[PDB]
């Protein structure tokens, strides 16, 4: 049914997960706990042994998402674009896919949430589905690893790749670099000869222009992902003059090489570093808690922070949730069969998103349906197809992938 009715039921199963976790080892004989009443009534709303009804469902879902004839209606641009009640009668859809969330309450709650103090550090898929599909907001306080937020920009083509380069002694003073790790951000200038004291501006790449840090330490370093950076000196003396930088959001200078915990935002323009002493190549590091500025999460999730082609793209973490489903597939030989049926699902999807209704030329995937990180780059590298249509395909395919990662898990045909 509706793109909605699939999210509401994805949220239901994602609640049955959380609660099956909450109830593990907290199921004692003389007491009926709060948590177990929920997990037990959430089974009542899927229409003694919960393995059975959950398994039956997963089985029917794989059978459904496998036959292009049935799950077809879901692969059309109309389904990702609007809340139109489809006229499709299919046993699966009739029995399991239905409106489950309480309106308007559900939403107001979510809204109230983005504003709360400590949000889930590893959010459910639901939140990510709503971001990628309805372009909704993410909690202001949720942290994320900056290197995922990374996309390719004019200057440098990639992030991880730059590693090899940064590790090679330079010939002459090169251009500035802006890389990102899991827990920190690096930027600086490499050179074989001294770089004079004074001011230097660094352009904050479009992908990082939505980041925010708290409890961050800023210092001079010479490693990227644990790989030595050459053409940079991390040395200094206590006598050295003070090196400070500024951001267009804060009227005050932010010190560097101090034990002080900083809070600033890379959103506004460029950062103005002020090297206090002349250094034979330098690399500044911003290590702290990274968050996505308020109302700027549409960039990362709507694939709007993408400007070049080809481009480096992450996967919105679907890879981390698929693990279960995959392990299930391998335990019953279906791994092969499912992959081919996905390649079919994928092709048939890309098809409807292209006038005239046919597979574009030059399209060959280098990875299977579940390595989405790569398939997304492959789809975002077809220069013979409009860019905006390329984006919608990735977005749309992701949601289908995620739904699979959620519904499949209890699969067991035999």
């Amino acid at each position: 049914m509706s793109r909605q009715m699939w999210l509401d039921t994805s949220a239901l199963l994602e609640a049955i997960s959380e609660y099956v976790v909450r109830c593990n080892g907290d199921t004692f004989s003389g007491l009926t706990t709060g948590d177990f009443n929920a997990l037990s009534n959430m089974f009542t709303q899927l229409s003694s042994d919960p393995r059975v009804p959950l398994q039956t469902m997963s089985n029917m879902f794989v059978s459904f998402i496998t036959s292009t004839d049935r799950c077809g209606y879901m692969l059309r641009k109309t389904w990702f674009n609007s809340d139109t009640k489809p006229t499709v009668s299919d046993d699966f859809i009739t029995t399991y896919i239905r409106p489950r969330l309480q309106v308007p309450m559900s939403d107001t709650v979510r809204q109230l949430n983005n504003l709360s103090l400590q949000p889930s550090a590893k959010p459910k898929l639901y939140e990510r589905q709503n971001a990628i599909m309805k372009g909704l907001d993410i909690p202001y306080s949720e942290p994320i690893e900056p290197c995922k937020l990374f996309r390719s920009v004019a200057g440098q083509t990639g992030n991880i790749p730059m590693m090899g380069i940064l590790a090679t002694p330079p010939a002459a003073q090169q251009q500035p670099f802006f890389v990102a790790e899991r827990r920190r951000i690096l930027f600086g200038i490499r050179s074989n000869a001294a770089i004079p004291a004074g001011a230097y501006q660094f352009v904050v790449p479009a992908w990082a222009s939505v980041l925010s840090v708290t409890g961050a330490y800023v210092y001079f370093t010479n490693s990227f992902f644990g790989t030595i950076i050459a053409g940079v000196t991390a040395t200094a003396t206590a006598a050295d003059a003070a090196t400070t930088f500024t951001v267009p959001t804060d009227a005050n200078n932010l010190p560097v090489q101090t034990d002080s915990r900083l809070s600033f935002s890379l959103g506004g323009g460029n950062i103005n570093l002020e090297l206090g002493v002349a250094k034979t190549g330098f690399c500044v590091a911003i290590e702290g808690e990274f968050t996505i500025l308020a109302n700027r999460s549409q960039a990362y999730y709507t694939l709007n922070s993408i400007t070049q082609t080809p481009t480096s793209i992450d996967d919105f973490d679907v890879s981390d949730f698929l693990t279960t489903f995959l392990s299930q597939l391998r335990a019953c030989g279906q791994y092969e069969i499912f992959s081919d049926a996905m390649d079919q699902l994928t092709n048939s999807l890309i098809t409807n998103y292209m006038d005239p209704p046919a597979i574009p030329a030059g399209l060959a995937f280098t990875s299977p349906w579940f390595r989405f990180s790569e398939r997304a780059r492959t789809i975002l590298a077809l220069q013979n197809v409009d860019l905006n249509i390329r984006k919608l395909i990735v977005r749309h395919l992701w949601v289908i992938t995620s739904l699979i990662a959620v519904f499949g898990r209890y699969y067991r045909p035999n």
Binding site: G30, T32, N41
Partner: protein, 97 residues
């Protein structure tokens, strides 16, 4: 009348014995008249309450059954949670205990 009477007298006016029976006679009444066939059964299974025909297992002995019913109610059993909580003037089950 008994329920009204409880508003003209401080606890101090009744035997700490009887005060307890009253709570029990009330719990009996709740389980007997306002509890679901499903709610009763759960309690009995978890040994919170004894079946109603066990006329003898309800006669008083130390335990404050009402407090126990209240302590083992489920979110959805609104009907009872009201009766009890109101009786106990807003105190939570763990407070009443």
């Amino acid at each position: 009348c008994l329920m009204l009477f409880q508003a003209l007298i401080p606890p101090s006016a009744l035997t700490a014995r009887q005060r307890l029976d009253i709570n029990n006679r009330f719990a009996y009444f709740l389980i007997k008249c306002h509890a679901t066939q499903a709610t009763t059964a759960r309690l009995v299974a978890n040994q919170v309450i004894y079946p109603v025909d066990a006329i003898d297992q309800w006669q008083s002995n130390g335990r404050d059954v009402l407090v126990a019913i209240y302590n083992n109610l489920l979110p959805g059993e609104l009907v009872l949670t009201n009766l009890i909580q109101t009786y106990f003037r807003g105190n939570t089950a763990q407070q009443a205990a």
